Amino acid sequence: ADRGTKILNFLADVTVNNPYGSRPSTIYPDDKLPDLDLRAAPPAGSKQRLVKLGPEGFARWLRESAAVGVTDTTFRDAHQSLLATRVRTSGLSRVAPYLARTMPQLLSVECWGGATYDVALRFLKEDPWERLATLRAAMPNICLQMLLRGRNTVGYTPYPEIVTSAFVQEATATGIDIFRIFDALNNIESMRPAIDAVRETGSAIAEVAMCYTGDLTDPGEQLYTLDYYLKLAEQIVDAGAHVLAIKDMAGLLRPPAAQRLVSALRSRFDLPVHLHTHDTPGGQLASYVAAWHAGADAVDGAAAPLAGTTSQPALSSIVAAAAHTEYDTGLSLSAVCALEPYWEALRKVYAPFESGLPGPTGRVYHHEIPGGQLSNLRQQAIALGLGDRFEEIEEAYAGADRVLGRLVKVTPTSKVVGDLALALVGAGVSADEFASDPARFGIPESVLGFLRGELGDPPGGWPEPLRTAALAGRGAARPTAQLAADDEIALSSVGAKRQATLNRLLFPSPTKEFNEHREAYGDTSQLSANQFFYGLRQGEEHRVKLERGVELLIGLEAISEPDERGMRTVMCILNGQLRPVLVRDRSIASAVPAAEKADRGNPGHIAAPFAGVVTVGVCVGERVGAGQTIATIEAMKMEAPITAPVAGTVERVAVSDTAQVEGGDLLVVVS
Amino acid sequence: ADRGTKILNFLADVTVNNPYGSRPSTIYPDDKLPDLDLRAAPPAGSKQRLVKLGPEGFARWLRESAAVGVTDTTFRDAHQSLLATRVRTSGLSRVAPYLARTMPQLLSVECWGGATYDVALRFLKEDPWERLATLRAAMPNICLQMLLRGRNTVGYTPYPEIVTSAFVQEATATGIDIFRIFDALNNIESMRPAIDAVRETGSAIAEVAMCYTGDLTDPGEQLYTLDYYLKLAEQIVDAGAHVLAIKDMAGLLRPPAAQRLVSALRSRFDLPVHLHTHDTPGGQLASYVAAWHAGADAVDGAAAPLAGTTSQPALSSIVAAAAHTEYDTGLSLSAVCALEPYWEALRKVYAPFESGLPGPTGRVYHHEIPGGQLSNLRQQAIALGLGDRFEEIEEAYAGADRVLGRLVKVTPTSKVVGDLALALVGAGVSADEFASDPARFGIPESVLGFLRGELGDPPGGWPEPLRTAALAGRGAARPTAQLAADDEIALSSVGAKRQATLNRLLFPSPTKEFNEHREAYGDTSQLSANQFFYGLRQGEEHRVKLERGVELLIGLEAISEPDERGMRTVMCILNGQLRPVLVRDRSIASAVPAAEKADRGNPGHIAAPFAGVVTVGVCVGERVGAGQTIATIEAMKMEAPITAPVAGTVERVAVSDTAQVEGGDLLVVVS
Ligand SMILES: *C(=O)CCCC[C@@H]1SC[C@@H]2NC(=O)N[C@@H]21
């Protein structure tokens, strides 16, 4: 931020380390954009219709119309299911004016909330609140939408009521128009406070959801029946919702079921219905077409280059499948197809992060992994070292889901099943064998917490013989911190003081890391994806942007060879003076490469399940009973105990006080 | 087949050269098949029904069937659209028994015709008739389908009549049962004789097809109106078709048009309808869903891994969308999903051959490149130098279609527009200039033949100002070959002599080269994909199947770099013993400069648009202007005489007669 002495450090560091394999070439997605009249002010519609009509009038207007609306999910959910949620502000912010000035007929644009809040701090290192202001400033004539999880505003644990109230108030203040609300399980009493808080402020609209799972049409279905959804919808409506919505996380909604459900909901109630689904199993446009022929009022689709597979159905097909008929959307097909090149180039830039899933898969009807989780789950598996064992990770996922009854696997309760499956695969015990003797097994902390009822009762009922056996003897007790004196009063002010308090109350570690990083180098939200992820080439010049009236040029001419043990140096050019920098190689240098022997087959040896940090506590001898805990292993968003399958003695222990461990080498030996 | 000495030569030769670069570790796709007893005969399927009811009654039975029929195109079109057309018969033959014993409710399997005949001769050196015989032997309870082009048959240009009749008789004698007659430019006159030839066999269903183009429900333009298709269907029905079809090569059939088009046809003619469509724009299952709600009786699908984008919609989606409803398909979703592992492994094996698109696109409404042509066209463009300029030709394709009297484009009439577009991306001139003054701009040997009238006449009509100017003053010399007296007598006999005669008549040069290879290396259709394509690795096991009752085990040990002698020496084990072998080093020995001098700054520099063998007829002096043919540049199936620049004086020709030159070089200089 301060001149270039600080940013150059980060650039040199990322250039030297750069944990990626080669690079094909440099792309500039900006170079492929249409030509229009940015100078002229944008048209109006679909946003001013709420400020001069009223939050309740908007629902009446939307329901009584012959044209079906559209929402663009390209901004949060499209890249969450394909690129593992690694799209920066620079990127999907230069095209916002084009979308505003070229497609005024949009109903809204889903841009905020979801899993982006975590990542923005943890990985991309940029204040989330800044993105929202810029997006609002760029699209001043279309309503924005948010995703909310009831009492788990953004996270995986219940939060106090005051925090949720302050968060909704602040989000409305900075700018939002539609709030989508859902709960992990289908329990209304766990999301009532959010609805009440949204209604209190007026202006913004409330919109409750009802997660979908199973299959209605199947005669054998007896848990997630139609009456279940009807009663849930009745509770939603009488709670005070302005709208009703359906969320299909995985894409298990078929045409006939959608027709029946939408018809019943429209018949029994007089509120607009909003739809949403991922396109994993195949072509899901049939569901939308069948739905809007019997009711419904809106749909969700993303750009064609980022559509299909795990992401959502394309928008061009939606527009083209209802033209020249009573359901004419109003958008222009030529207008909406003029931006595909930009999104295609943008996707081409994010090659290394593209985990995704190459093509349709008909096996999603078995494991039911929701979209928007395959990419992140694959990244997590790759990190732990179990990368190329993903057919074994899907089977364990299905088994774990089956053993626990039948859960509504959505964002908060999907981490539980994912972690349980990873633990089962890493250890070596199959899911069906976990239920028989869940005593000599290391349950991760999150899974154990779920079994204590901290996320509400499941809709099917607890497993009677499994819950009791897996909880006895694990010391079920943990206190919680509270807002003592200052955070209570800070959450009442408005400005850039409540935002910091919210950030620090939601994620302490990420936020302090982000503060330290920003204090070390400076603001880094004005760079391109290449400059931030890959670093610097040689010879070619770069354009670094900081602020209006400020611009700098950087260039790389040579890189010094790795010194014996001193340091590595690089030289850059800020148009002159060939300013050098000093950086260190955390990968080129290698220590003594002699890992401890890894032994298998012998029943009297203790390995490590997956890679991580081990803090072993044990003494020589000290006869250990079967199933007793020995050491704890901690990894990214995970922590599990490790137990000795067979009783005996300790004999030899060969592990440092605290050090990383391979897939598994040796922890303790028993006889 | 062989004795080992010959096959070893082929393996050693392929191990050297092998332009494909580094490859991952070996993988066996044959280890992921289901488990079941392969000794019981497959259940009774649809071939028995066809034999019992005859060709006529089968159509009547299909007409009054509530269940919607299904077809499997994984064998012919799924790998034609995605993986060029390279799928050796060895891979396919290993899953046919499982498909026959697991999914006996399929209507038919499309596994021959269209474009396999040529590639299976000149690239994958094997005999198509043997592949057909093997596939028939594998599946004795499912009808086999074929794509026939009427006069063209399986070639590109017209063929005499006795050849087509003999071809049909041989094909129906060797196993095929269901033919799909279609013509590029919709006119019953062209394809009338083929229908009569098919009907004379006695048991073979003639399914005529009508192409779809433009849009039906849009009132904008009225050329391809509903009346046009109604008249065409009337003509087809009066011709004597057994079943009516609707081939949608590009994938431009939307729901609102589809329902009307199908409903109108069901209320006049009592024939069944069969629909075919690609999945290029987006989710195309909506078209099927809206079609069988109106009276459609069949649809085409494909294996889930080889589905989406340019291929047909997934088969599992088709089975699921019609499950537990009145239009039940009959298949079992559990059984279908059990074969995906094999297909995905197989696609992983054929990784080097990959063409098409990475994600769904919405701009197919602009260029309208048929599905099943973009892949085989990308491979054609790479070999001519144009490998990265694959987006700049979309506007050229659109222009070529527009200037030429909007028309229908299937394989014979789309090979012409593609050639024109490829030639128009050479010198650098645009479509509008070409239409303005066609005389100056040169024309390929395919477009000229189309304009002459050898192919037909579009429904729109020959453009007046263009045709008369693009024919006169150029030439017209297209002689016709005559059948040898001793050759025609052979076509009246059944067996293998007729098969060889047909092979020579349809494709002379590929047949000669295939015979040469057969003499040189013996049979090679029993090898696996890895061995045939790539070669051999370092010390390992290679289970090689030579023929019945012999399983030669082979393994490479050491390759000796050529120190002085250009020849290389490789030693290969054969049942324990060792045997040196000698192979050439064609790739290694390559050293030749080339002065391109293709700069566009100074006119008069005639540059070869693409790479190939160029013949020059102009000598020193003899100054000429434009229009006159200067050199007959030739390349992969594309005789395109090069244009002529403005007049001047011919001084230096930097090329000898024939000679080799690459795209972007200098052929003749004038001034
Ligand atoms: C760190 O990267 C946070 C966890 C990743 C996001 C998780 S994966 C499981 C949930 N589903 C989803 O879409 N996001 C959540």
Ligand SMILES: *C(=O)CCCC[C@@H]1SC[C@@H]2NC(=O)N[C@@H]21
């Ligand atoms: C030479 O044989 C090249 C491969 C075959 C080309 C095929 S013919 C059918 C498709 N249409 C087209 O234009 N090319 C494809």
Ligand SMILES: [Zn+2]
């Ligand atoms: Zn979603």
Ligand SMILES: [Zn+2]
């Ligand atoms: Zn096709």
